Amino acid sequence: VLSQIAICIWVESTAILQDCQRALSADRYQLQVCESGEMLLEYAQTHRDQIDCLILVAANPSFRAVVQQLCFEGVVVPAIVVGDRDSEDPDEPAKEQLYHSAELHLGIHQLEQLPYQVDAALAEFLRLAPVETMADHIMLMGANHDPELSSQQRDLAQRLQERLGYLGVYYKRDPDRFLRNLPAYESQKLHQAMQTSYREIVLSYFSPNSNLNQSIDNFVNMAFFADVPVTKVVEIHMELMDEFAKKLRVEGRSEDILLDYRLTLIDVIAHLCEMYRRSIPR
């Protein structure tokens, strides 16, 4: 029970084309090949509601022009941009947005597992819609995009979600206790608690018989239910490494040993990851 995926691709290199055709050989994928920018435009504006994912070679003649016209006509669909333009090393993935904010970037040699990248493009578009097109704007603002009616993106997304989404049950984490929603006092409090917990983890990490799994669980629970960005976990790890580095300096010990706790970090993050992963329904 998985929907067909309507893929349209603007490609003018035969090698790239065949790479795509091979990767997307599964019956699930329906491929439209466009061999020129004008032909791509002609297909898009006449098949506006029949394109699930665009695959666009960035080096193709009049790329920015074609993309800009696409954005102006309101053809903003999930997309994979292959390579870059002949000045910024064409074979390699681009370092900035060319079409829109949910686009994926692939080098010409990262195409063998295209099914998974198509999954990623679709999902990311579904997550970010309405998407900031880096070709419709443009220096104006606005509030700061629009036509307010050009949010047919929403509609597209909705359509897509009927075919590529599925409902499932999740635990109602209280958004008021999310880190990003905490007032200063609470924020500071959670910060200190998480520091204390992580310090327990570090102190007992290399000790035998210490119930490591329990301390780690204690930290990870707070990280998960307060919806803490992984970077903040990293941040805590380093604040602790600083505390210990000062303690070691003062006591005349080498701080090199701190490198070992990189293994702790991995561990913790691993756990956090698996908590999110195993929480995905079905």
Residue 190 touching ligand BNT (CB under 6 A): yes
Chosen residue from 164, 245, 248, 258 binding its own copies by CB under 8 A: 164
Stretch that binds ligand BNT, among 60-68, 154-162, 237-245, 250-258 (CB under 6 A): 60-68
Show contacts with its own copies in window 230-259 (CB under 8 A). Answer: 230-231, 234, 259
Q: Among its own copies, ligand BNT, none, what binds residue 171 when CB lies within 5 to 8 Å by partner kind?
A: its own copies
* Cβ–Cβ under 8 Å, residues 60 and 40: no
Chosen residue from 38, 73, 186, 200 binding ligand BNT by CB under 6 A: 186
Other C-beta atoms within 10 Å of 225: how many? 14
Stretch that binds ligand BNT, among 41-49, 127-135, 183-191, 261-269 (CB under 6 A): 183-191
Residue 242 touching ligand BNT (CB under 6 A): no
Phi and psi, residue 204, nearest 5°: -95, 0
Residue 89 touching ligand BNT (CB under 6 A): no
What is the pattern of x (binds ligand BNT, CB under 6 A) and - over residues 160-179? -----------------x--
Residue of 122, 92, 85, 127 lying closest to 104 (CA atoms): 122
Number of residues that bind ligand BNT (CB under 6 A): 21
Residue 41 touching ligand BNT (CB under 6 A): no
* Cβ–Cβ under 8 Å, residues 80 and 104: yes
* Cβ–Cβ under 8 Å, residues 78 and 124: yes
Specify the long-range contacts of residues 91-98, CB closer than 8 Å, at least 24 apart. Answer: 94/58, 96/134, 97/134, 98/58, 98/63, 98/64, 98/67, 98/134, 98/135
